[PDB]
Design a protein around this ligand. Sequence first.
Ligand code: HEM
Ligand SMILES: *[C@@H]1O[C@H](CO)[C@@H](O)[C@H](O)[C@H]1NC(C)=O
Ligand SMILES: *[C@@H]1O[C@H](CO)[C@@H](O)[C@H](O)[C@H]1NC(C)=O
Ligand SMILES: c1ccc(-n2ccnc2)cc1
Ligand SMILES: [Mg+2]
Length: 225
Amino acid sequence: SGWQAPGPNDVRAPCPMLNTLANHGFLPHDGKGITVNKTIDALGSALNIDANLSTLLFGFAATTNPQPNATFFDLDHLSRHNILEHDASLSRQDSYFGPADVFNEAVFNQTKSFWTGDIIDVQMAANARIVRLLTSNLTNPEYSLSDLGSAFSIGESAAYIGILGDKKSATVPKSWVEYLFENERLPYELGFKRPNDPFTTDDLGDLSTQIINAQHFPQSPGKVE
Ligand code: HEM
Ligand SMILES: *[C@@H]1O[C@H](CO)[C@@H](O)[C@H](O)[C@H]1NC(C)=O
Ligand SMILES: *[C@@H]1O[C@H](CO)[C@@H](O)[C@H](O)[C@H]1NC(C)=O
Ligand SMILES: c1ccc(-n2ccnc2)cc1
Ligand SMILES: [Mg+2]
């Protein structure tokens, strides 16, 4: 009741949240044929994402469809390397090593080790992302991070805090974030509840700026902001 794993003809993304929303049936369970209206309704219904932010994200998503000027995308279109998908993901390996769409325990064990308390704050989120960037640069001879990929990286850490947790305190319970990643299911039973206030483009930008301000390199090595 309310959740089904994907089956052999379903497609999934490198996005733990869209995967979770397909598993629940907010998005089509097969991951296919997602339009702007399905995106607005799904992200609104499940998470209280506002329409303008949903439309922005949809605009990016549609660029991954191999069909030009497409009005839909499928979740596996999002896995195409270096369109939106990028190196130094928190829970996916880099494309160079292996498929960059599915959960990777080794990678997620690294991320988790930088979430040092029961409550994730901006500092811990920023620190986990940093070590992923540096690790990929020092281990992946094809490491790359485009301007768009860097903006995505920073906004994905902002998103788990502000969409799953409390955008005002900029904190989220660690257990909730680990449950989302490890299960691709919303952690309702751990306490998650859809927020009453919409999550906006400005909310995402505000948390993204917080993430960057929590970075304290003596000297920045490559693309970090
Ligand atoms: C239409 C909406 C969305 C699109 C098009 C989208 C797209 C993507 C893509 C392409 C990635 C992979 C980037 C990479 O290589 O790591 C990703 C990662 C991610 N997304 Fe989404 N996303 C959407 C909505 C959301 C929402 C609503 C959340 C809320 C929590 C979210 C949280 C994340 C997180 C946390 C990651 C990072 C995964 C990792 O680093 O392992 N996304 N998303
Ligand atoms: C991830 O950590 C778990 C928990 O300590 C461990 O059992 C597992 O072997 C680790 N996986 C990798 C590939 O490091
Ligand atoms: C990887 O590290 C090098 C050496 O600091 C840096 O010049 C480069 O910009 C980094 N690559 C990315 C994509 O950040
Ligand atoms: C710009 C910045 C971040 C994102 N994003 C957030 C979570 N998944 C994708 C999408 C566009
Ligand atoms: Mg990636």
